[PDB]
Amino acid sequence: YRQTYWMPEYTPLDSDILACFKITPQPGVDREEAAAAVAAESSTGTWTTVWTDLLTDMDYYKGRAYRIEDVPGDDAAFYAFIAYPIDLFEEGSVVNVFTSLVGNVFGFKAVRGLRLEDVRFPLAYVKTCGGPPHGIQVERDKMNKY
Amino acid sequence: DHLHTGTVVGKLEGDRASTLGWIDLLRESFIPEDRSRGIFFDQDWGSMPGVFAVASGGIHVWHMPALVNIFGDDSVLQFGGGTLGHPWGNAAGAAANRVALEACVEARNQGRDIEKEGKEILTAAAQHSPELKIAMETWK
Amino acid sequence: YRQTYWMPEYTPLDSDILACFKITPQPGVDREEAAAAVAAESSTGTWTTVWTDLLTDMDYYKGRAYRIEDVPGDDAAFYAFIAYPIDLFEEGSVVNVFTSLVGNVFGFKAVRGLRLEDVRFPLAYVKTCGGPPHGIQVERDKMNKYGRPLLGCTIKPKLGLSAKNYGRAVYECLRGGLDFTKDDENINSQPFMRWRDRFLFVQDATETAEAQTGERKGHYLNVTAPTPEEMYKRAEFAKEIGAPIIMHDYITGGFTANTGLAKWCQDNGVLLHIHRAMHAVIDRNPNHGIHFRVLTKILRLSGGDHLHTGTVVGKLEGDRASTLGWIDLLRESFIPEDRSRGIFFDQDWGSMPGVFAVASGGIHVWHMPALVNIFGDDSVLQFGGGTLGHPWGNAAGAAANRVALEACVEARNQGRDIEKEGKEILTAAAQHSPELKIAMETWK
Amino acid sequence: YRQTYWMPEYTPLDSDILACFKITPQPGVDREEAAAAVAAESSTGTWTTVWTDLLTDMDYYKGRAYRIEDVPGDDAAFYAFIAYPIDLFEEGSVVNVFTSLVGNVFGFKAVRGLRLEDVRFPLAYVKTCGGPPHGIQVERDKMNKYGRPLLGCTIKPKLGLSAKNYGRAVYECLRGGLDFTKDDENINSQPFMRWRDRFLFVQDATETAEAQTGERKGHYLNVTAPTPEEMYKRAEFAKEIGAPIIMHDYITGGFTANTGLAKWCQDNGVLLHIHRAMHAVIDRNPNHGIHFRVLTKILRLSGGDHLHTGTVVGKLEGDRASTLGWIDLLRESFIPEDRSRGIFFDQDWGSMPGVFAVASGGIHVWHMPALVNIFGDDSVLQFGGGTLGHPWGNAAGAAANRVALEACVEARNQGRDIEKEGKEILTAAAQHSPELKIAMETWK
Amino acid sequence: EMQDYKQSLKYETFSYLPPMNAERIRAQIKYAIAQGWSPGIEHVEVKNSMNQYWYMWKLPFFGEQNVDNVLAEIEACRSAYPTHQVKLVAYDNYAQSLGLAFVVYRGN
Amino acid sequence: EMQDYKQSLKYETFSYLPPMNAERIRAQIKYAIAQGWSPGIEHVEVKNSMNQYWYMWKLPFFGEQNVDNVLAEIEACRSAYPTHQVKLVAYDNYAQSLGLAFVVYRGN
């Protein structure tokens, strides 16, 4: 499980979707193991390689944990940083990104608690979504309020 | 029409009541109050049809007699790993799962304790199903 | 003019749109001045600061020239590199980017000639455009064709054939062995042959050929129309009758119309063949115009499954690098900078699917080993003359071309130098194909 | 190749489409051969007779070169006159005619350069196209403006203005005295300024200026869009908010899209301003390209109420004839052949209404008497810098331009030589207009 | 002197060439392996040859370097289904397509 | 060691098991009766087995407690239609569905 979905050396691309998870693991389980577990269950969901896995580019289509940090003031939790390729998600679908990130990882039984702290939306994925219909300045111009 | 409810077998024997209670909430027309199963209110559904129960996640041919005994006929059993991880392929894994399902259903219909005799029933079925036999060999 | 719109120190952002202009300036004018002139006229268009200028962030909303390079072999021209913020353009509008880049700068009077050589599309702007409706791999999956280049043919003459006669040329061409036939860029709906009758008879011929051969068949039905309503009606009729592929003229028809048709094709699952008519009025002059590599980038941004790129063999051995470079631009996911091949910028395409390369014009069975070696499997080879000029007919010519293609592909797969052994391979294939043998005899 | 597609004896029919090509051939090749080559590649594209050729009337369905003339002052080029039957083209498709004429001939390798100088549209083909939606006289009737050229202005900078700030430039420009303001060819919908907010604030400013002045006002709202659906949506929104005129880029947007938008404008009673962006990549080179007179014919066939034609004063006195000739092509009902002005064919327009001439680029109050004398009343004069650069503001600049225009028009009506007496007329007008006086002081 | 073309059902790539022998099939398998593709075996009824989805013979040979083993598997497929068409494919995982595909036996 | 899966037409519930004999059919009938369901017998042509509606053999055995009688009726249906597939059903009136359904004879 370990060597496959967590790469300490991996440098995340500017188009990669980055997610930070506060993992409160069960005592005794490995921090890197739990980080790879969140990365896998949020990207592929399994470790057992099946014959259909070999039909795809496994090195590309997977989420990888690249950094683990201590939580200040909480020795029972650690921060897991995971990088996701932009190719893993529908363009302009907050629904799809949200589902891919939080579909099953929060039901993981080897951690006592899981919190999604921050998510990095790259400018490439940002440019696809419509965003706010008007925005602050356009709304101010329309309402004539300054 | 379908809804994921959990595999039930994935919890310990003493922590299955709430899952069974919400299974009854999903499927049955009238669920009496049951504090042990977590049903706090009498819930009358009238004529609204039930919803199929879906069990999925880390379940294979060995859990199957327990799955049949717990869920009954009105359920959907999902085998992602238990079908794709078959050494002979997806078709062979699906055939193994189907043969196991039919054998367990017939054993339940005959009045046998399928959970107590699950290994014997599955072995007897595998005497006629090489795909099923190799499936148990893989997932033992 | 100088200090305001050209910054030697500026480092371009990964989201910036970069453009390379070959400037042939009037003698005596400053190179940096001309670079700033292209940058300004392509971004703001003026130097005199007006009171409305002070209401905006002038430091941001402007194009800047950041590098000037000498042109190898041409002392009278220099290369100007200009960076454009992504904010200057409508998201997903090749029309808007193209207009902003080439609206007025080519009319500049202080330069003798201006050529747009390369344009860098950042991945952020790339992710917004729809791109090719299907792509090479999806088209291959749909057509159930693998391991060899596709074969096409242009039905000739361009004039005179009724619907039924055009269909009875298409039918023999397809039943002979070609995967596709091609409507000409002139044929959309003429008095001698109306478009609906074209579509009906072409679909009949394609279905008959598919039934009699056992291979998926298609015809690039031209939907280029005077109005977008007419174009959409023709495409919808093609889908209704079941035509798997249509054709559009993306330059004469227009970039807006091509983008709309590509979006419709992606929505409706219809393959799109793109013809590059008029491209020569733009990309031929070495000192004034916009390069066909830029046109190829624009086309693949807009959307299309096929694109004419040239026959490559039609040029000398020392003039093939630019064609190969824009071939890589059209087909590959990431094309590193290559000055020898004319690739001035690193071009990252991400997940956008490639576009089939179409080679057409004066090519026959003899050019074929070279065509295979140069283009690879992901290309479409068109044989108008090489199929219609066959003495035994369209079916025999198509059979000859198909046999030659299969023989060359197998020879390449066996590890042979197909270009060095082309004559031997073709003769060995002709020992089992009289149609192929007489084809080489005709076109020797 | 020779005897087949060029007939010296052929007399062209009144319904034939005639095209004049300036051929700069490779040295040593035959003039008649090159003429037949352009004729063939623009009509049929091949010389090798195939079996499908014999199924058609080859004598009819072909373009023929009937006359070769020397180019005055250029011994390396000659003029090729080619006749095309009206049957070769879709009725009412400038796209199809343009494609048939310029699809492949410009890529001919046996000529060093090819220019399409003039094209004769017969009245039979002219009667099929919709033409300008309204025309000069109908637009004048709708806007209630007579006896003087119209005044326009391009809102600058091209970048940075929010919707409200752009509207507060347009409002002062219109309330100052200009009949129209102009959206830039770059502005359709950018992140800093969305198109709907543009349309709303522009309509508010136009209505306010019209109410405060007492004259009909307008703004060429740009509807050039990545997709025809988006373009039609923007035009429909402009009509819904009540905008009397919109603008399209007919070259970058596309001829099909422009024809569709022109038909929609004719249907919905919305005036159409046409911008000629990119025209320089095509019409600038003297030896390779398609002439702006041909582009003007194509545009007026497609449909449009205004068209940029150049400032005329921007060229020397000895280089104005071609501009005047295409001005006459755009505006007049029948333009006789004139080799001095570059009119190679008699062009009969019948009842198709003329298109307003737009002069824009580096022109101010001083050029104005010359502009009036050259263009006449049926023209639109655009003052971007000459209005926005006014030290007292947009309103003062517009007032200066309007006062100068009215003074020049009255001077012309009185029988004075306005070009000879321009300074005196402008000074006499400035004796009653401080804004005009300071305008000449600024731009002297 | 001209010869009439004889029409017959065709089967895509390499179908216009004489049927491949053991040497040619081995060369094709070696090419597919050298390209990094995974060989695969499929079979269907002759009337059902057109289907996009063929009966899969065993599993694609991932990481297989034995051309003789691939040929032996092809012959085993033929023996198990004598009346079925036999096709050889090569999966390109990077492009998610097939780098090579041709029929070994044309059915009967 | 790897052998191919042999494809054949499959007939829903209990079709992946060896054909049931008299004892197994009697056990199924006893289960259906003990569940309170009404046994029923249907038959159809083999090519028409997929149809939602089969030929109905007499009437559903409402309140029937004789497993031997139901089996004898199944055999009588087989005798009357030797070439037809034979199915046994169990009507669940409360759920308006079938609690059990499987084919006794597989057609020929």
Please, do chains D and F touch (3+ CB pairs < 8 Å)?
no
* Interchain contact C393–E (C-beta under 8 A): yes
Please say whether the beta carbons of F32 and B105 come within 8 A.
no
Separation of first and last alpha carbons in chain D? 61
Tokens of residue C177, six digits: 């062995």
In a mutagenesis test of the A interface, which of C89, C127, C263 is the best target, namely the one with the most A β-carbons within 10 Å? C127
Question: Which residues have CB under 8 Å from C412's CB, separation 6+?
Answer: C372, C373, C418
- Other CB atoms within 10 A of residue D145 CB: 16
Largest CA distance in chain F: 53
Cis preceding linkage at D149, omega within 30: no
Tell me the pairing of strands C245-249 and A64-71: unpaired
- Other CB atoms within 10 A of residue C429 CB: 25
Instruction: Answer yes or no: do E58 and B89 touch at CB < 8 A.
Output: yes
Q: What is the 3-state secondary structure (H, E, C) of chain C?
A: CHHHHECCCCCCCCCCEEEEEEEEECCCCCHHHHHHHHHHHHHCCCCCCCCCHHHCCCCCCCCEEEEEEEECCEEEEEEEEEEECHHHCCCCCHHHHHHHHHCCHHHCCCEEEEEEEEEECCHHHHCCCCCCCCCHHHHHHHHCCCCCCEEECECCCCCCCCHHHHHHHHHHHHHHCCCEEECCCCCCCECCECHHHHHHHHHHHHHHHHHHHCCCCEEEEECCCCCHHHHHHHHHHHHHHCCCEEEEECCCCCHHHHHHHHHHHHHHCCEEEEECCCHHHHHCCCCCEECHHHHHHHHHHHCCCEEECCCCCCCCHHHCHHHHHHHHHHHCCEECCECCCCECCCEECCCCCCCEEEECCCCCHHHHHHHHHHHCCCEEEECCHHHHCCCCCHHHHHHHHHHHHHHHHHHHHCCCCCCCCHHHHHHHHHCCCHHHHHHHHHHC
Tokens of residue B135, six digits: 């499936």
Tokens of residue C444, six digits: 């020797």
Q: Which residue has the tokens 């046999």?
A: C403
Please say whether the beta carbons of C217 and C204 come within 8 A.
no
Nearest to D69 by CA among D126, D16, D20, D140: D20
In a mutagenesis test of the E interface, which of C137, C144, C146, C418 is the best target, namely the one with the most E β-carbons within 10 Å? C146
Please say whether the beta carbons of D156 and C46 come within 8 A.
yes
In angstroms, the CA A135 to CA A133 distance is 6
Q: Tell me, yes or no, if D364 is annotated catalytic.
A: no
Catalytic residue among D142, D145, D156, D239: D156
In angstroms, the CA B42 to CA B32 distance is 5
In angstroms, the CA C201 to CA C220 distance is 13
Name the resolution in angstroms: 3.3
Interface size, chain B vs chain E, as Cβ–Cβ contacts under 8 Å: 6
Provide the 8-state DSSP code for F35: T
DSSP H helical ranges for D123-222: 123-126, 136-143, 163-176, 195-213
Which residues does residue A18 pair with via DSSP β-bridges, in sequence order? A83, A120
Does C287 show up as a binding residue in the annotation?
no
Burial bucket for residue C259 (CB in 10 Å: 0-12, 13-18, 19+): buried
Tokens of residue F16, six digits: 């992946």
Nearest 5 degrees, angle CA D96-CA D100-CA D102?
115
Which residues does residue C6 pair with via DSSP β-bridges, in sequence order? C65
* Interchain contact E56–F (C-beta under 8 A): no
Nearest CA in chain C to D390: C50
Output the CA torsion sign for F23, F26, F32, F35.
negative
Does C276 show up as a binding residue in the annotation?
yes
Which residues of C participate in catalysis according to the annotation? Answer: 156, 275
In angstroms, the CA D125 to CA D15 distance is 8
Tell me the pairing of strands D306-308 and D356-359: parallel
Please say whether the beta carbons of A41 and A6 come within 8 A.
no
Tell me the pairing of strands C150-152 and E85-92: unpaired
In angstroms, the CA D410 to CA F50 distance is 93
Show residues of chain B in contact with A50, CB under 8 Å: 81, 84-85
As a whole number of Å, the CA-based R_g of chain E is 15
Tokens of residue E14, six digits: 């390499």
CA C32 and chain centroid, separation = 33
| SS3 state of residue D162 | coil
In angstroms, the CA E40 to CA C146 distance is 14
Q: Tell me, yes or no, if D156 is annotated catalytic.
A: yes
Nearest to D323 by CA among D354, D345, D299, D291: D291
Instruction: Answer yes or no: do D256 and C98 touch at CB < 8 A.
Output: no
Amino acid at C151: L
Show residues of chain C in contact with D160, CB under 8 Å: 53, 55-58, 60-61
In angstroms, the CA B57 to CA C371 distance is 52
Provide the 8-state DSSP code for D221: E
* Structure obtained using: cryo-EM
Question: Which residues have CB under 8 Å from C235's CB, separation 6+?
Answer: C223, C246, C261, C264, C265, C268, C270
Catalytic residue among D134, D273, D275, D306: D275
Please say whether the beta carbons of D14 and D122 come within 8 A.
yes
Interface chains of chain D (3 or more CB pairs under 8 Å): A, C
In angstroms, the CA D77 to CA D82 distance is 16
| SS3 state of residue F53 | coil
Calculated CA dihedral for residues E66, E71, E75, E76, nearest 10 degrees: 20
The kind and range of the H/E element at E100 are strand E97-105
What CATH number does domain D136-443 carry, 3.40.50.2300, 3.40.50.720, 3.40.50.11030, 3.20.20.110?
3.20.20.110
Amino acid at D217: K
In angstroms, the CA C333 to CA E93 distance is 15
Which residues does residue D270 pair with via DSSP β-bridges, in sequence order? none
In angstroms, the CA C291 to CA C263 distance is 25
Nearest 5 degrees, angle CA D419-CA D423-CA D428?
120
- Other CB atoms within 10 A of residue D423 CB: 11
Nearest CA in chain E to B88: E58
Instruction: Answer yes or no: do E60 and A55 touch at CB < 8 A.
Output: yes
Please say whether the beta carbons of C261 and C227 come within 8 A.
no
Which whole-number Å values give the CA distances from B114 to B53, B66, B127, C442, in the listed order? 20, 7, 17, 79
Nearest CA in chain E to B92: E58
Nearest to D198 by CA among D161, D154, D225, D242: D161
Nearest to D408 by CA among D366, D368, D357, D377: D368
CA D38 and chain centroid, separation = 27
In angstroms, the CA C91 to CA A129 distance is 11
Which whole-number Å values give the CA distances from C125 to A12, C335, D268, in the listed order? 20, 17, 35
Nearest 5 degrees, angle CA D255-CA D261-CA D262?
85
Show residues of chain B in contact with F17, CB under 8 Å: 99, 102-103, 106, 125, 128
Q: Considering only CB atoms, which residues of chain E are within 8 Å of chain A?
A: 38, 59-60, 62, 91, 93-94, 96
The kind and range of the H/E element at D3 are helix D2-5
DSSP H helical ranges for D15-143: 31-43, 94-102, 123-126, 136-143
Instruction: Answer yes or no: do D277 and C253 touch at CB < 8 A.
Output: no
Output the CA torsion sign for A25, A27, A32, A37.
negative
Strand order in the sheet with F55-56: F55-56, F38-44, F85-92, F97-105
Nearest to D117 by CA among D287, D263, D268: D287
Output the CA torsion sign for C417, C419, C423, C425.
positive
Positions at the binding site of D for substrate? 104, 154, 158, 276, 308, 360
Which residues does residue D79 pair with via DSSP β-bridges, in sequence order? D22, D69
Name the residue facing A54 among E62, E94, E96 (closest C-beta): E62
CA distance C298 to chain E (A): 23
Nearest to E45 by CA among E87, E75, E76: E87
CA distance A88 to chain C (A): 10
Instruction: Answer yes or no: do E17 and C403 touch at CB < 8 A.
Output: yes
Which residues does residue A65 pair with via DSSP β-bridges, in sequence order? A6, A82
Nearest 5 degrees, angle CA C339-CA C340-CA C344?
20
Amino acid at C173: C
Query: Any long-range contacts for A97-106 (C-beta under 8 Å, 24+ apart)?
Result: A97/A17, A97/A125, A100/A42, A100/A43, A101/A19, A101/A42, A102/A42, A103/A42, A104/A41, A104/A42, A104/A45, A105/A21, A105/A37, A105/A38, A105/A41, A105/A42
CA distance A60 to chain C (A): 12
Tokens of residue B83, six digits: 């079908």
Nearest to C433 by CA among C408, C413, C416: C408
Nearest to F108 by CA among F56, F48, F46: F46
| SS3 state of residue E47 | helix
Nearest CA in chain F to E57: F4
Q: Which residue has the tokens 């006592």?
A: A112
Output the CA torsion sign for C127, C129, C133, C135.
negative
In angstroms, the CA B92 to CA B77 distance is 17
CA atoms within 13 A on the CB side of D285: 26
Separation of first and last alpha carbons in chain A? 57
Question: Which residues have CB under 8 Å from D136's CB, separation 6+?
Answer: D305, D331, D353, D354, D355, D356, D378
Amino acid at E59: L
CA atoms within 13 A on the CB side of A27: 2
Does C216 show up as a binding residue in the annotation?
no
Provide the 8-state DSSP code for E15: T
In angstroms, the CA B98 to CA B100 distance is 5
Tokens of residue A27, six digits: 């005592």
Nearest 5 degrees, angle CA C311-CA C314-CA C315?
115
Buried b / exposed e along A89-99 (16+ C-beta atoms within 10 A): bebbeeeebee
Tokens of residue D274, six digits: 């046409």
Calculated CA dihedral for residues F68, F72, F73, F78, nearest 10 degrees: 140
Instruction: Answer yes or no: do F2 and E58 touch at CB < 8 A.
Output: yes
Helix B64-71 and helix B118-126, axial crossing angle in degrees, nearest 10: 120
Provide the 8-state DSSP code for E107: -
Nearest 5 degrees, angle CA C175-CA C181-CA C185?
160
Tokens of residue B3, six digits: 């809804």
Residues 95-124 of C with CB under 8 A from A: 123-124
Which whole-number Å values give the CA distances from D213 to C93, D382, D384, D432, in the listed order? 38, 20, 21, 19
Which whole-number Å values give the CA distances from C348 to C15, C119, C323, C330, in the listed order? 11, 12, 19, 12
Show residues of chain A in contact with D166, CB under 8 Å: none
In angstroms, the CA F40 to CA F89 distance is 5
Domain limits of chain E?
1-108
CA atoms within 13 A on the CB side of F46: 9
Nearest to E37 by CA among E88, E90, E74: E90
The secondary structure of chain F in percent helix, strand, coil, rounded to multiples of 5, reads 30, 25, 50
Show residues of chain E in contact with C429, CB under 8 Å: 17
Question: Which residues have CB under 8 Å from F57's CB, separation 6+?
Answer: F40, F41, F42, F43, F73, F77, F80
C149 — phi, psi (to 5°)?
A: -65, 155
Which residues does residue C68 pair with via DSSP β-bridges, in sequence order? C80
Strand order in the sheet with D218-222: D150-152, D379-382, D356-359, D306-308, D271-275, D245-249, D218-222, D180-182
- Other CB atoms within 10 A of residue C160 CB: 22
In angstroms, the CA C47 to CA C41 distance is 9
Nearest to C135 by CA among C415, C353, C432, C444: C353
In angstroms, the CA C400 to CA C433 distance is 7
Largest CA distance in chain E: 53
In angstroms, the CA A108 to CA A33 distance is 12
Name the residue facing E97 among C141, C391, C403 (closest C-beta): C141
Please say whether the beta carbons of C368 and C425 come within 8 A.
no
Instruction: Answer yes or no: do C148 and E10 touch at CB < 8 A.
Output: no
Output the CA torsion sign for C98, C99, C101, C103.
positive
Q: What is the 3-state secondary structure (H, E, C) of D380-410?
A: EEECCHHHHCCCCCHHHHHHHHHHHHHHHHH
Please, do chains F and A touch (3+ CB pairs < 8 Å)?
no
Amino acid at C37: A
Provide the 8-state DSSP code for F59: -
Nearest to D247 by CA among D209, D215, D216, D219: D219
